């Protein structure tokens, strides 16, 4: 389990290091106002999102450039490009089944509230003639 | 007494002699015993339905023993407890105003769980006034809970959030609690956008598995028509609708557009200059080329973030090339999420017409096409490949059309495309 | 097999010095606040946030495998976690599936047994 291992190892140490990045990030942009401003920390709700989509969207870019520097000339020999295509297919397989079961809950709860209306209308009626006792 | 009630005949004919006995755990808990389904149904009639009625009690109790883990199988008894308790509005709130803060949560997060996905779907507040306040300080409190150190997440947070999605969908399809349905939908959204569970590294989709439902939800509710609440209350807002179009599920997206070209019908007649028609063509306006005709530097605020942060950002990203960069990967060819679903889109489209040249790679790209389209010319310039193809924006609208055949989950994309690119509107 | 093992060393030098990162800023950071300590200063910031979101921090080196760590995890991730919501979604749709028929035999037998006791109203609406 060598090259298992190894893998796992990768895991545990790149999520360490896109943690540690994304803080960094984080830590940098506060720094920034920090020594600009004096003590101007009241980033408001609507300012905190609008450095988080920053935030995000660069991660974004620097995640599409990988993108062009594994794929254009497939080495097939890469033991990490050979880790992106079955992490890249893996991907998008389940893709159908949410769709589907999503809309297979967005009818079956139409058929619980229905049958459930009708049994309030049921029992309203039912107590109305067990009152006309 | 109603053991000795053997038939439905034998319930109508003795029913006021009926004697209504004591025994609740067994009336409740699973010939002589044909009608036991009818048994607490019944004794709720017998007698009006008041508070102190055996089986609301009897069930409050053993949910509250299930809580407190004394309970030999707690799996066993829930349907049960849901089954009656999800067709009663009465015992249903009882439940909810006793198991529906922060302090019932501490003790099982997974039992609460499965209650709330009973309970939760079907439900009327009694009164529409003391319970917006009331989820949404659960559902903060829920959240606290879910995210704090020690222990990263566990869906515990995004799947109680559908089940008051669900909810939701129970009260906007009734009247006179919608405003209890989209004022308290607005406030789980900004809930669910935040980024310590809606992230863009680890995200853990379950926020945004749960969030397409709820943004489906009020798209349902576009879709029908012939009903009156502010739009006010259905314009997601670009403080967290930025938030999605930058993530990178591609369903995510999908479910987005879909929810977006599901406002245009019931948009436009608003007027043009409109406090929220604003933001709605802003999303228009650019996520129209985060996927396509990207002229992202030539425009500005991508996201509302600024464009030159990519100008700065593109730099000292380091690319083996520099042919084309600016426009590189800006689109369908090119985005992260929906790049490598494209190349299969072209690969299972290549293996239809049996192609002989067999795109080498996988990337689609401005300057891969370039070169698998030069190197391999007078060939394919006789045959073996997709037909129409003379430029790469052909190879994107048959991506498009081929996208645009329900059988992937990804289809509202295209329908986007056709409906809000005006270019490319002739399919 | 050498290559991703060289690959951990490298990221642990890239974590290392990110760390280091982390910990200068933060020492900026807290030493800007300790000199400006007279008291919880949060004001409003004035059109510099703007000037701020024109631009990043922390340009990349180009030898920094970071933007693979952005893509290996976010997509293994965005894969180990759809199997369990599926799980949960079929294992919830199964649940509601067998429960609405629970409900509906039921609130059939209701129905019929409205029209019982009804009819019988009547027909001992007679004496």
């Given at each position: 389990?060598?090259?298992?291992?190894?893998?796992?190892?990768?895991?545990?140490?790149?999520?360490?290091?896109?943690?540690?990045?994304?803080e960094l990030?984080i830590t940098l942009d506060r720094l920034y106002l920090i020594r600009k401003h004096n003590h101007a920390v009241i980033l408001?709700?609507?300012?905190?999102?609008?450095?988080?989509?920053?935030?995000?969207?660069?991660?974004?870019?620097?995640?599409?450039?990988?993108?062009?520097?594994?794929?254009?000339?497939?080495?097939?020999?890469?033991?990490?490009?050979?880790?992106?295509?079955?992490?890249?297919?893996?991907?998008?397989?389940?893709?159908?089944?949410?769709?589907?079961?999503?809309?297979?809950?967005?009818?079956?709860?139409?058929?619980?509230?229905?049958?459930?209306?009708?049994?309030?209308?049921?029992?309203?009626?039912?107590?109305?003639?067990?009152?006309?006792? | 007494?109603?053991?000795?009630?053997?038939?439905?005949?034998?319930?109508?004919?003795?029913?006021?002699?009926?004697?209504?006995?004591?025994?609740?755990?067994?009336?409740?808990?699973?010939?002589?015993?044909?009608?036991?389904?009818?048994?607490?149904?019944?004794?709720?009639?017998?007698?009006?339905?008041?508070?102190?009625?055996?089986?609301?009690?009897?069930?409050?109790?053993?949910?509250?023993?299930?809580?407190?883990?004394?309970?030999?199988?707690?799996?066993?008894?829930?349907?049960?407890?849901?089954?009656?308790?999800?067709?009663?509005?009465?015992?249903?709130?009882?439940?909810?105003?006793?198991?529906?803060?922060?302090?019932?949560?501490?003790?099982?997060?997974?039992?609460?769980?499965?209650?709330?996905?009973?309970?939760?779907?079907?439900?009327?507040?009694?009164?529409?006034?003391?319970?917006?306040?009331?989820?949404?300080?659960?559902?903060?409190?829920?959240?606290?809970?879910?995210?704090?150190?020690?222990?990263?997440?566990?869906?515990?947070?995004?799947?109680?959030?559908?089940?008051?999605?669900?909810?939701?969908?129970?009260?906007?399809?009734?009247?006179?609690?919608?405003?209890?349905?989209?004022?308290?939908?607005?406030?789980?959204?900004?809930?669910?956008?935040?980024?310590?569970?809606?992230?863009?590294?680890?995200?853990?989709?379950?926020?945004?598995?749960?969030?397409?439902?709820?943004?489906?939800?009020?798209?349902?509710?576009?879709?029908?028509?012939?009903?009156?609440?502010?739009?006010?209350?259905?314009?997601?807002?670009?403080?967290?609708?930025?938030?999605?179009?930058?993530?990178?599920?591609?369903?995510?997206?999908?479910?987005?557009?879909?929810?977006?070209?599901?406002?245009?019908?019931?948009?436009?007649?608003?007027?043009?200059?409109?406090?929220?028609?604003?933001?709605?063509?802003?999303?228009?306006?650019?996520?129209?080329?985060?996927?396509?005709?990207?002229?992202?530097?030539?425009?500005?605020?991508?996201?509302?973030?600024?464009?030159?942060?990519?100008?700065?950002?593109?730099?000292?990203?380091?690319?083996?090339?520099?042919?084309?960069?600016?426009?590189?990967?800006?689109?369908?060819?090119?985005?992260?999420?929906?790049?490598?679903?494209?190349?299969?889109?072209?690969?299972?489209?290549?293996?239809?017409?049996?192609?002989?040249?067999?795109?080498?790679?996988?990337?689609?790209?401005?300057?891969?096409?370039?070169?698998?389209?030069?190197?391999?010319?007078?060939?394919?310039?006789?045959?073996?490949?997709?037909?129409?193809?003379?430029?790469?924006?052909?190879?994107?609208?048959?991506?498009?059309?081929?996208?645009?055949?329900?059988?992937?989950?990804?289809?509202?994309?295209?329908?986007?495309?056709?409906?809000?690119?005006?270019?490319?509107?002739?399919? | 097999?050498?290559?991703?093992?060289?690959?951990?060393?490298?990221?642990?030098?890239?974590?290392?010095?990110?760390?280091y990162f982390l910990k200068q800023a933060q020492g900026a950071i807290d030493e800007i606040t300790k000199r400006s300590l007279d008291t919880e200063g949060k004001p409003?910031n004035?059109?510099?946030?703007?000037?701020?979101?024109?631009?990043?921090?922390?340009?990349?080196?180009?030898?920094?495998?970071?933007?693979?760590?952005?893509?290996?995890?976010?997509?293994?991730?965005?894969?180990?976690?759809?199997?369990?919501?599926?799980?949960?979604?079929?294992?919830?749709?199964?649940?509601?599936?067998?429960?609405?028929?629970?409900?509906?035999?039921?609130?059939?037998?209701?129905?019929?047994?409205?029209?019982?006791?009804?009819?019988?109203?009547?027909?001992?609406?007679?004496?």
């Amino acid at each position: 389990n060598s090259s298992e291992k190894q893998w796992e190892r990768i895991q545990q140490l790149e999520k360490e290091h896109v943690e540690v990045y994304r803080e960094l990030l984080i830590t940098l942009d506060r720094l920034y106002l920090i020594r600009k401003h004096n003590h101007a920390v009241i980033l408001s709700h609507t300012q905190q999102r609008l450095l988080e989509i920053r935030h995000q969207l660069q991660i974004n870019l620097e995640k599409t450039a990988l993108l062009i520097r594994l794929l254009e000339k497939p080495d097939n020999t890469n033991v990490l490009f050979t880790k992106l295509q079955n992490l890249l297919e893996e991907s998008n397989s389940l893709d159908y089944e949410l769709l589907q079961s999503l809309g297979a809950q967005s009818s079956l709860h139409k058929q619980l509230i229905e049958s459930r209306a009708e049994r309030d209308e049921l029992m309203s009626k039912l107590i109305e003639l067990s009152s006309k006792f | 007494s109603l053991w000795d009630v053997t038939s439905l005949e034998q319930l109508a004919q003795n029913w006021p002699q009926l004697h209504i006995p004591n025994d609740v755990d067994y009336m409740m808990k699973p010939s002589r015993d044909s009608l036991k389904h009818l048994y607490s149904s019944i004794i709720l009639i017998k007698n009006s339905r008041d508070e102190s009625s055996s089986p609301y009690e009897w069930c409050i109790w053993q949910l509250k023993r299930c809580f407190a883990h004394q309970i030999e199988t707690p799996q066993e008894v829930i349907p049960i407890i849901i089954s009656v308790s999800s067709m009663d509005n009465k015992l249903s709130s009882r439940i909810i105003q006793t198991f529906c803060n922060l302090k019932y949560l501490k003790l099982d997060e997974l039992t609460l769980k499965k209650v709330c996905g009973g309970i939760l779907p079907l439900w009327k507040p009694e009164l529409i006034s003391g319970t917006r306040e009331f989820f949404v300080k659960f559902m903060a409190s829920i959240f606290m809970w879910s995210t704090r150190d020690g222990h990263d997440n566990n869906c515990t947070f995004s799947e109680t959030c559908f089940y008051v999605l669900q909810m939701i969908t129970n009260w906007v399809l009734d009247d006179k609690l919608i405003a209890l349905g989209l004022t308290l939908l607005h406030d789980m959204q900004s809930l669910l956008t935040l980024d310590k569970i809606f992230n863009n590294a680890t995200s853990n989709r379950f926020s945004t598995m749960a969030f397409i439902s709820s943004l489906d939800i009020l798209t349902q509710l576009s879709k029908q028509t012939k009903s009156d609440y502010a739009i006010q209350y259905l314009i997601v807002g670009p403080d967290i609708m930025n938030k999605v179009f930058s993530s990178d599920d591609p369903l995510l997206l999908s479910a987005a557009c879909r929810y977006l070209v599901a406002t245009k019908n019931k948009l436009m007649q608003y007027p043009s200059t409109n406090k929220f028609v604003r933001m709605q063509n802003q999303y228009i306006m650019d996520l129209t080329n985060y996927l396509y005709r990207n002229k992202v530097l030539s425009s500005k605020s991508l996201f509302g973030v600024s464009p030159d942060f990519f100008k700065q950002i593109l730099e000292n990203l380091y690319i083996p090339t520099a042919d084309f960069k600016n426009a590189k990967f800006f689109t369908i060819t090119g985005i992260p999420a929906l790049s490598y679903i494209c190349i299969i889109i072209l690969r299972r489209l290549e293996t239809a017409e049996n192609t002989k040249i067999k795109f080498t790679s996988g990337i689609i790209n401005e300057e891969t096409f370039n070169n698998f389209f030069r190197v391999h010319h007078d060939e394919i310039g006789q045959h073996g490949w997709i037909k129409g193809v003379n430029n790469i924006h052909d190879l994107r609208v048959k991506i498009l059309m081929h996208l645009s055949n329900t059988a992937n989950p990804y289809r509202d994309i295209a329908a986007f495309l056709f409906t809000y690119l005006k270019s490319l509107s002739k399919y | 097999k050498d290559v991703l093992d060289v690959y951990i060393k490298n990221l642990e030098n890239q974590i290392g010095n990110k760390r280091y990162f982390l910990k200068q800023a933060q020492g900026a950071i807290d030493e800007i606040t300790k000199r400006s300590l007279d008291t919880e200063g949060k004001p409003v910031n004035s059109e510099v946030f703007t000037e701020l979101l024109r631009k990043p921090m922390f340009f990349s080196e180009r030898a920094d495998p970071i933007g693979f760590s952005l893509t290996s995890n976010f997509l293994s991730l965005r894969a180990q976690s759809s199997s369990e919501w599926l799980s949960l979604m079929n294992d919830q749709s199964v649940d509601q599936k067998a429960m609405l028929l629970l409900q509906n035999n039921i609130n059939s037998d209701l129905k019929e047994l409205l029209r019982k006791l009804q009819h019988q109203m009547t027909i001992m609406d007679s004496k």
